[model samples]
Target chain A: MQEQRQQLLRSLEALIFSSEEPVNLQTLSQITAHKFTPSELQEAVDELNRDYEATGRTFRIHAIAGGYRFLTEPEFADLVRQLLAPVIQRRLSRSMLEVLAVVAWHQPVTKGEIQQIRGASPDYSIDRLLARGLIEVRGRADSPGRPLQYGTTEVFLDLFHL
Target chain B: MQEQRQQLLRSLEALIFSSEEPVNLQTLSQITAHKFTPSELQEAVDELNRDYEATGRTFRIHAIAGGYRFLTEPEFADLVRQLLAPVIQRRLSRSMLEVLAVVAWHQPVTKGEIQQIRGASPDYSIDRLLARGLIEVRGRADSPGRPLQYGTTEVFLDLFHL
Candidate 1:
């Protein structure tokens, strides 16, 4: 590959790899100074995508959330879970999963309601979910308690497939 | 709702909430005490689905991995993202992200190949994946080194839609 292409690939990979979210062509052009056309950047990304999809590759470049992000293809999820297990020991705990599931299936649910329904403290579960970035407070319930309401995050969506 | 209906709902909710993996009708029946028939369970789940959909709720019961799971609807993803920003933080460091992304996408790949691609100190990443149970050593490498090969676990696929 030419120096320009190599440089562009590095730039593209860096931009995509570090992205907490996906990116589009315009963003790539703005970030990389080589002055590649939109189509050029798009083409470059496509080529890079192919390289990533190669036999030895681990991740796939996908267009998600209206942009490109380096995400673990579901194929190797088990490996990731295993690797992540010890670190986020609290991530998959019973309370955490319960709270996360409740919020996921019934978003905008109040904290009080979560506790009442669960017949548990919910403090730890709520804290764990919040810490994991899987669940968040979407708004406040308008009931007598006016407790905070919760919902699942985009990371949750990206992770679990919305 | 009738007392029996309410009990069934709670049973379903508690069972589904507690499980990180999907819960099928048969399994759910087994777990929640096999009083209800599969058809009965299916009807209740279908009713729950309809209620969620009819009210334009941002949550719903999703059927995934050949079972049912509680998940958020996609429309409110942005709202959740903004709320989760503080919680996500810098947990996934660059090297971790780089390594995990590999194990997550191209799992079952050899540690040596990962080492070769990642270069130096794949030990940390591999160990981390193993500890988390996100990834596992599926087998040995086919190459000369005969190093251990890593792959994703069921937890990963269950969470990430791999």
Candidate 2:
């Protein structure tokens, strides 16, 4: 039992260390064949987090995306980003921010309306928005031929924290 | 007086509404020109938040980023996103996402090292990242001629919940 616990922890740690994203307990359970219950895994992770935090490690295991992943301590963001090699930069732009502001404030809006609002081409912004899965075409509006209405996704909400 | 109570409530609600960021007690106090103590403002905001929450509105004023903003009700997101007609789709390109991922993961790094890890010219990515304010040159590295180090800011952390 002790040996299995140790092994499970090692596995969890390894999984967390290897990835950029957090892996939740449910997913980890499947990988380990339910060797750890969600609660047990959570408790274990909590302990692990404490262990690392206590030692003042810059990186610690924590929950995110309804799962678990390692995050650098906020104070050590520089170190973590540097050590990680390929770090991410701003995923949003002014044009995108404007579009996002419009969609969040205005919903069920048409592509043409957005273009009209911007008084310029909206194709690139909307297309790129669609591709990233942040925004999707909901359906045709009830208007003539129902020009497609666009809106955000849960991923957008989650990413944008909206 | 009843009017005084209304004024206080209005003040608290104002504290909860305007900013897109979270507002804590101290912030509320400051915003009010320090007429009230942080604790007093917190008590009022709490009351306001709880009272507003009790109404079960389609949106709830939330505190994050040490300020406040009204966000879609947890259960109402689907419909909210559906109806919000003018939301701008937040979009990023593959290269942008890649660079963003690298910059976020490895902040406080130098352009030279960033190029080394990404195995590509970091110019475009860095430009975009800086433009978005997700990554910035904090200071230079220690080596010869010391390339500038890059890092994420509160704005980046706030946007992505990272």
Candidate 3:
């Protein structure tokens, strides 16, 4: 029994560590046949964190974005920032964010409504978001324009950590 | 002379094309001698646009972000989207977007205030934004906490197409 529990903890750690984003317990349960419940997974994570703390390790598994991911402690942030500068420099822009926020806040919204709120044409932003899989066209709006209605995707929720 | 005018137009095209961001008249004048005035540059841009349109080109120069730069016409959005996919594949997350929007909407606000509005701790979000240069601690607030006030940077505007 102890051996099986150890295996589950190791597997859970590997799953979360290997993922580019957070890993939810539901996903972990679906992917495994270990009969591990959500609470068990959470306990494993908590124990793992406690072990790391006791060992004076500088990282912890954070429950965030409706999932769990390993995050560096605050003390190591500056060093990590230096290492990540080039990648972070390529982060998303304002227009993209504005359009994303609009779609996120108001799902099944039309392009015209987005433009109206932003007071700028959302043509480029919408196209970019669609290509990035952050947003998708659900259907046509009932308005006279019959514009395509847009809504956030599963990726969008993960993207924004909602 | 007509030859001098042609040279100016060519120079303008090269300058704008090579630049990663918008190229304004002031910068253009400083780069070149004052021999090419802003009005002269504007006329050259107009002439260039007319030529590009006449040739049925897929791209044209647009005045955006307080300056002029080349942008693919709407007809070529599909092509551009495909081209930008790999880069667009790396996108901001929902938590990052939420923090960014709060900073954009309320500048020089403290972390405590942000957490209050968001109903969650924004430590990692703030750290990520700081690393990305999207937000910075402008100063300390006068309130009880005297927490470091955060505000969106100019990069925030460019990133979101504000």
DockQ score for model 3, please? 0.06
Give the per-residue lDDT digits (tens) of candidate 2, residues A1-162.
Answer: 998777877887887787544477667777878767667888888878887879878776655436576655557555645543333233344455556555654555788788777686544667666666677654446577657667666666655333
lDDT of 1 by residue, B1-117 (tens): 598787878788778867765688778877767566757877888887787789887777765535777766557665654455333322232344456555644556876677777
Judging by TM-score against the true structure, name the best candidate: 3
CA RMSD, predictions in order: 20.2, 20.5, 14.5
Candidate 2 C-alpha lDDT tens digits along B1-162: 887877878876776676534567666666666577656655666777687778865665544434455666546546655354323333233355556555555556787887888798545667776666666555556788866677666666565433
Ranked by lDDT, top first: 3, 1, 2
Candidate 1: chain B TM-score equals 0.48
In the order shown, the candidates' DockQ scores are 0.02, 0.03, 0.06
Q: Per-residue alpha-carbon lDDT of model 1 for A31-132, expressed as tens digits?
A: 786676766767887888788777668776765434676656657766765674433443334345456656655566777778877688446667767766
| Reference-based lDDT, each prediction | 0.64, 0.62, 0.70
Which structure among the candidates has the greatest lDDT?
3
